[PDB]
């Protein structure tokens, strides 16, 4: 269920039919790994199997020593917040001496439990790997002795497997200063991660969404290194919370619109600047100017309200009436009539100016359409490629019906003698007043010229 | 064979002599892995070596289950296209019924083979790993039984080796949602990639170009996960193919050019904005405003037409005549007379204004030159460092001849009383008309005051 509409007069296209999945909040979870505070190896025996356990044990001791040091278009209008501020407040609560202990207590019998912290919040904590029990119960009594022996090399392999997960986790943290994104399968396996989503205090629809799209959740999640004390290592995992789901979303593609005079220096241009994602939200509209920060899986849209603006529903009028009196549609002007192209969701927009060659072709029959000078559109049905001069683009092959909304390019209504071609962050009214300011300028000068003597 | 010219009057420098390797299009390639439809381990033996096979085997079973879940300055003028649209459309064709089966057949006996798809296009395919054959023929009959035995432990290690490649490929996709770039050695070894490049439908020159710089091809490639069914795993690899090669490329460095009055805020500035990469292309010029999207290997230049503009050949006049009548050269204006520096390929440009200390030094003899206020230049021959106050830069030590082309700085020709110092995306004619338009009104207005 995907649609798309192109407005010939505004050189822009709107794709409708998408569904929402906006990150509203955060849940913090504590991940623990039971470590064994091991120091002097007493044994100095000579044996190949022994050597492997020793040098593997030094990798463990070195890894903990590393982590011990670790403990101590219109985007310019968006806000600035600390995304990992939630994890920070949590990991700081872990620095409390009693807080670490309450964790070990809660996870004595089972591997997963909810813990109420000293601040008074309930967070889900879980132990994922137990090296303390393996090392101290199977290795420390051997190594503490003068002459030690290892029978069967499989003992060495079993140790490397259990210890390997720690080194890759340590490796990830040592190059990212304790803040990793996305969250790796080393950091949290899917079997572990789904146990969180299933046990998270969220609604069933939220559960079903996260579970079918875990790889997206990973990218919008942070793994915060917290502390490592007593005989446990802990790090906090910051997970996104989607408070808004399934509201109708739509994407805005824009492209420059210019005149087509033969003399190059005489042309004037205008381009709609509000391209990006729009999603309904409580009668308002959350807007995302940088579509790169949003991920799409199937027909669902995952964005972050962090880089959003809350707009009135009337912003939708800019596509269906750019000269409406209720919302001033933002635009910019220039005299740079250069050929470029924009790929839409079900097709492509083409801005063809000057003598640049602009064509679209089929994989089987070759060129099917050659564009005129100006801004045109074509649907993905039966079209596969698009060429603007030497630049070549491919088009998305997502199915859906597209509709061409014909209309005279709006730039034809502006007198270039008074056109403010130097406005970069403007809008409809901002342009008209700049013209009205320039129109009054010559007019009074004419009136003063008219009433002399 | 690299050169460089500095223009004293426009406060900019051009580096010439490079060669082109611009990606005009894409080639899609299909990678297959024969997997084994495995069910629950029947054996529950109490052997340490067997236990290792069990837990290693579960890494395989979960990895497949993981992927089984997976299938459910002036840059603002550039175009906007979906680069991976080509690979995406292909992976969708794989979802078509019957397409998967004809693949498994075509490369049953051999590995690399050409397959014609349902739509009618020929794509290059290759088999990279057979776990189905090893697991089902050597392990599955054992595990299917109650009591199972593992004798030589070397058997376990060989399984760890074969299975490790699968686990790392699965991990890469789970953190990139099936779209990874560059293409890792896990995704495709160099031996495998050259078998593709040699068998690719490209020109001999393209073959030699890609082969001597494969690591760049990796960076301009995408690995798209496609499908996984019928005891087969497949994912498409999008490869850049360079339709334009060896045309003369040149890189433009720009820096601000200002006046040199003592009084602060009384200075006016002008900066050339069209910095980036330029390459000849079919009598036109492909321009890349974001030089970061371009990679340089030796004297070769690798860019993407996706982030290019196709400009006429006359655009080049901006370096040797910014006041030509055929191309309006883009610039920006400000009253921001701040000191800064730009490192070129064969030297460095220095913008020194106000009371700022600006010097360049040699690694052996220390300070060699002290700059005057304004826009100056120095070549890298015998010079290694550049200092702007306390800020320090190093210079590229690639050899080549640099030329200082003297000429009076163009900013000196502008009347500061009428200079539009508040324009950010302008050009010569756009400012010249703005000056001429703003200059004319006071002239008539003043005469009115006389009588």
């Amino acid at each position: 269920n995907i649609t798309e509409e192109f407005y010939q007069s505004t050189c822009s296209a709107v794709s409708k039919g998408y569904l929402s999945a906006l990150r509203t909040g955060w849940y913090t979870s504590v991940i623990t790994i039971e470590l064994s505070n091991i120091k002097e190896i007493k044994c100095n025996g000579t044996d190949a199997k022994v050597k492997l356990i020793k040098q593997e044990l030094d990798k463990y001791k070195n890894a903990v020593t590393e982590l011990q040091l670790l403990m101590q278009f219109l985007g310019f209008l968006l806000g600035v917040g600390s995304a990992i501020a939630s994890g920070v407040a949590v990991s700081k609560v872990l620095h409390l001496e009693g807080e670490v202990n309450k964790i070990k207590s809660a996870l004595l019998s089972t591997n997963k439990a909810v813990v109420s912290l000293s601040n008074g919040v309930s967070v889900l904590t879980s132990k994922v790997l137990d090296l303390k029990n393996y090392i101290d119960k199977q290795l420390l009594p051997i190594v503490n002795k003068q002459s030690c022996s290892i029978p069967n090399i499989e003992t060495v392999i079993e140790f490397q497997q259990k210890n390997n997960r720690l080194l890759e986790i340590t490796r990830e943290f040592s190059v990212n200063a304790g803040v990793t994104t996305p969250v790796s399968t080393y950091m949290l396996t899917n079997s572990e991660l789904l146990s969180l989503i299933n046990d998270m205090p969220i609604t069933n629809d939220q559960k079903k969404l996260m579970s079918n799209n875990v790889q997206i959740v990973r990218q919008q999640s942070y793994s915060i290194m917290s502390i490592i004390k007593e005989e446990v290592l802990a790090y906090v995992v910051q997970l996104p919370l989607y408070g808004v789901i399934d509201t109708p979303c739509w994407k805005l593609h824009t492209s420059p619109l210019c005149t087509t005079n033969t003399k190059e220096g005489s042309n004037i241009c205008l381009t709609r600047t509000d391209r990006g994602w729009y999603c309904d939200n409580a009668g308002s509209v959350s807007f995302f100017p940088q579509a790169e920060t949003c991920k799409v899986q199937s027909n669902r849209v995952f964005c972050d309200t962090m880089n959003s603006l809350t707009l009135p529903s009337e912003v939708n009028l800019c596509n269906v009436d750019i000269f409406n009196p209720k919302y001033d549609c933002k635009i910019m002007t220039s005299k740079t009539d250069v050929s470029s192209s924009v790929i839409t969701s079900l097709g492509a927009i083409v801005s063809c100016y000057g003598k640049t060659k602009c064509t679209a072709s089929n994989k089987n029959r070759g060129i099917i359409k050659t564009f005129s000078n100006g801004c045109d559109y074509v649907s993905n049905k039966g079209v596969d490629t698009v060429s603007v001069g030497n630049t070549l683009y491919y088009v998305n092959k997502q199915e859906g019906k597209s509709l061409y909304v014909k209309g005279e390019p709006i730039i034809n209504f502006y007198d270039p003698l008074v056109f403010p071609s130097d406005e970069f962050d403007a809008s409809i009214s901002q342009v008209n007043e700049k013209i009205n300011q320039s129109l009054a300028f010559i007019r009074k000068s004419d009136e003063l010229l008219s009433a002399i003597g | 064979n690299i050169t460089e010219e500095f223009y004293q009057s426009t406060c900019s420098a051009v580096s010439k002599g490079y060669l082109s390797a611009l990606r005009t299009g894409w080639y899609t390639s299909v990678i297959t892995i024969e997997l084994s439809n495995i069910k629950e381990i029947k054996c529950n033996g109490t052997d340490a070596k067997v236990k290792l096979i069990k837990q290693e085997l579960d890494k395989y079973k979960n990895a497949v289950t993981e992927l089984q879940l997976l299938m459910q300055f002036l840059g603002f003028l550039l175009g906007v296209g979906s680069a991976i649209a080509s690979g995406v459309a292909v992976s969708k064709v794989l979802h078509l019924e019957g397409e998967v089966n004809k693949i498994k057949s075509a490369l049953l006996s051999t590995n690399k083979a050409v397959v014609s798809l349902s739509n009618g296009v020929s794509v290059l395919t290759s088999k990279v790993l057979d776990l189905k054959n090893y697991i089902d023929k050597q392990l599955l009959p054992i595990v299917n039984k109650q009591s199972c035995s593992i004798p030589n432990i070397e058997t376990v290690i060989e399984f760890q080796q074969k299975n490790n490649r699968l686990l790392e490929i699965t991990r890469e996709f789970s953190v990139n949602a099936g779209v990874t770039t560059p293409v890792s050695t896990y995704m495709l070894t160099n031996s495998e990639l050259l078998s593709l490049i040699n068998d690719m439908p490209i020109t001999n020159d393209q073959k030699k170009l890609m082969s001597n710089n494969v690591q760049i091809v990796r960076q301009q490639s995408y690995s798209i996960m496609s499908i996984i069914k019928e005891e087969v795993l497949a994912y498409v690899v999008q490869l850049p193919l360079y339709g334009v090669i060896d045309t003369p490329c040149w890189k433009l460095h720009t820096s601000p050019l200002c006046t040199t009055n003592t009084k602060e805020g009384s200075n006016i500035c002008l900066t050339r904005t069209d910095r980036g990469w330029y390459c000849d292309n079919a009598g036109s010029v492909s321009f890349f405003p974001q030089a970061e999207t371009c990679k340089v290997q030796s004297n070769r230049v690798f860019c993407d037409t996706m982030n290019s503009l196709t400009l006429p050949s006359e655009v080049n006049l901006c370096n040797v005549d910014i006041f030509n009548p055929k191309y309006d050269c883009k610039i920006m204006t400000s009253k921001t007379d701040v000191s800064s520096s730009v490192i070129t390929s064969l030297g460095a440009i220095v913008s020194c204004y106000g009371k700022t200390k600006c010097t360049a030094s040699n690694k052996n003899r220390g300070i060699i030159k002290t700059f005057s206020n304004g826009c100056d230049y120095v070549s890298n021959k015998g010079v290694d460092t550049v200092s702007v106050g306390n800020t320090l830069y190093y210079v590229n030590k690639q050899e080549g001849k640099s030329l200082y082309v003297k000429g009076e700085p163009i900013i000196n020709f502008y009347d500061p009383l009428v200079f539009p110092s508040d324009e950010f995306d302008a050009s010569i004619s756009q400012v010249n008309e703005k000056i001429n338009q703003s200059l004319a009104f006071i002239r008539k207005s003043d005469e009115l005051l006389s009588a």
Partner: antibody
Amino acid sequence: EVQLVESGGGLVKPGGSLRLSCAASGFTFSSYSMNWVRQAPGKGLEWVSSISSSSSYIYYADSVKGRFTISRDNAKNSLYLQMNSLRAEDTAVYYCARLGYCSGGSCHFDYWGQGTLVTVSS
Amino acid sequence: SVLTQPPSVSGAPGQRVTISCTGSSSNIGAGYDVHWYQQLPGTAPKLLIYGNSNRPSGVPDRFSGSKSGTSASLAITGLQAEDEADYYCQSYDSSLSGFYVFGTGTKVTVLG
């Protein structure tokens, strides 16, 4: 508009040498790849040698490797083909041809010169 | 190997004629594109159709080309006498250090 002018061809004995010259004009020469294609009387067309736009890549047809030497001068708009140990079987009309641009390799020759005749016989 | 064309093709003015260009697995079957060149007798061969199916500027739309599998075809609909000439299809083969391949040639004889 686009022009190509061959020269230098004529009669020479087997084993002799000849340098063919092709002068182009009307466009930006140093941007395109150039090629030589020949044709014996009553026979088909045969590609001889290729040269990149900046001389960086050169290949010869397996029939003539080691005997023919291609060169270009991007400043003179010139293309040269040195031919040594010429044989009577090489007797053909030699055409100067430009390699056009395509989206993805395997390009076409968009413009051709008028050709020069090289006749070798004892 | 080399591309295969029938040497003699005859037709009356206004007839429809097709040219078969049979390749092999080492050229077309590898995916390379096909181009066609028109050679008036004694003249320089000029480009007729490029990119399998595209006519350049100043080529009558009467000419049309197709590519499928390992074969190629050129359609001349409504033949006229100014087309009595030699026609060659051209592609690229990957064997033996690579080399541009040409067809065996088609002399179209307009029965006037």
